[PDB]
Amino acid sequence: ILSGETSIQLTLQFLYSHNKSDLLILKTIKQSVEMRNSVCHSATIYANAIMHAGTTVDTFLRENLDWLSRATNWAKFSATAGLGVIHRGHLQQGRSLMAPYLPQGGAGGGGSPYSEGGALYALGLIHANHGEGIKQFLRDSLRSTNVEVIQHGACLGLGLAALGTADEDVFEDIKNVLYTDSAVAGEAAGISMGLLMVGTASEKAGEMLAYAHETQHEKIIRGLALGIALTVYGREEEADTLIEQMTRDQDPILRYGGMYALALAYRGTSNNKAIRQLLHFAVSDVSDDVRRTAVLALGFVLYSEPEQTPRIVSLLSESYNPHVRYGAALAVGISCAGTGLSEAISLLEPLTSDVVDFVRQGALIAMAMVMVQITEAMDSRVGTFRRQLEKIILDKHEDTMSKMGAILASGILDAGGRNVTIRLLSKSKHDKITAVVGLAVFSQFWYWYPLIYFISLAFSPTAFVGLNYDLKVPKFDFLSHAKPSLFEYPKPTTAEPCFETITNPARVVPAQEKFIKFLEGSRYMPVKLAASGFVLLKDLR
Amino acid sequence: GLRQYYLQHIHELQLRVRNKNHNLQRLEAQRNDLNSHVRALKEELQLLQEPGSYVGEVVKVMGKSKVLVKVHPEGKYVVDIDKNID
């Protein structure tokens, strides 16, 4: 249990058994996407990977191999990396499933280096946080290969497999790759050192900052600037010295990292000092990248109190600067993820019709993050939004960035077979490090598209799984005192009873938790009154 | 002593909160009028980018929104009507 292997296996069984992903949506998107547009082709691969996250269903890729074989360079890297999101949590066969795409140590493996690098990144996504068996294999793969694309996938895979383990030996191996000054491997190395050292406040953050001043490669500076921001996770006042150094820097890319460092230092605290500094930089800086990030960073400071975020961001959404309006859309998307707040939806609606294509892209993604798992019976606006997404995807005259946003939004709405939600806070009100970090890396998809797969880390399964003394799942029934239509799955392509008696092992949305009651006289009684998650049952018979 | 010691700050915080809200709203509206003016002005930048509009004088109208008017130097022609014209 403490290793997480049992909780992952039970989650994977739940996601496999309850997979209600609509393959017709993906078939429609595939037919509307022009075959020459590499961005829309990559967007459909990302949407497929998000829709089937942890369900092990690869049927769409198997049926469409002739369409996948048209992927070139980084689209082929992403195609292979997308298998890691689909097979997420499959710890035992994770190596055997990837074996055809892994670098075979003989001069006769006809793989493309993009597929081999993407397979190493896929292994890290499958074994995220649970790297004990694969850490050595990824280290040996990193040391054996001088190809930048394979090193890029190995670094990111190793950073995901070793997330928050503070392993010094993995740090020195990734640091040796950073000192090769390769523009693509160094961006991954920068992020991976940050992922390894999350929230340690190590003096090593000073070594990363020193190297960020020496390198001429903007990709390495950006990867290090985010990597430094990840080391500072959790640290509040201990971070202020390093944040003041990064924010007074001459380089706009280091100031951009300084805004993430402030966001990740003051995550979920709602601190007035941090909010005032972020709002100051959102207006005073000359760089639109710093301005966008300063507004986006408000979403990470304010997610503890999602009701305050629309009020603060409303004034920024009306700004003349499109980068600030984009940051405003994503700030609300991150803070209000899975809450369904009506104020947040009313603020995002105008931004979906913006003149600027990337503002529309941000608004569509943010709306999908807020509306994740919401039914048309709870809010009629979900039905209008799904028709709007379909319209944008079918239209030929729409901009490529707005289409990419609509495809990703459709993927996020139907994520994990409709059984996952984006959740920054645990039920215990602890910060989910993987979800905050996953969303902070995900927000950088403008510079590097393969970072889109980090959204998978922010997916929390919405399951009730009752377990016996032997850690097996018994069949038993429990009552929901709500109308079934509120917590139903959307219908496929073509007062009331309030005692929906579904099996205790079933999808339970956070809004449904208040209506769940155990039947007095059932064979199984919970040791603790918990309405969702893993609950141990006392057998009375 | 709890009634006269702890709960007393609830009746105090709200008084300042109410005035801060109004002052912030007034300042925000003052800034918002200006921001909207600036956004408009930048919109007129592209407004003057689009091609102009010709002048027309319909000599004869036709049912179902058909128009044949006098072009200044050219003449007349058969066209349709707009979306919000009686």
């Binding site: 709602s270 909010i275 305050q308 700004s319 | 609830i10 300042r16 809200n21 912030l24």
Partner: peptide
């Protein structure tokens, strides 16, 4: 709970307080 109404009221008031600097920043950037 009885002390919660005061603690929450203080939290919201403090949050609205930063709105002064927030507005002041735009009043000059605008």
């Amino acid at each position: 709970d009885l002390y919660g109404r005061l603690k929450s009221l203080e939290r919201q008031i403090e949050f609205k307080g930063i709105q002064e600097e927030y507005v002041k920043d735009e009043l000059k950037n605008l």
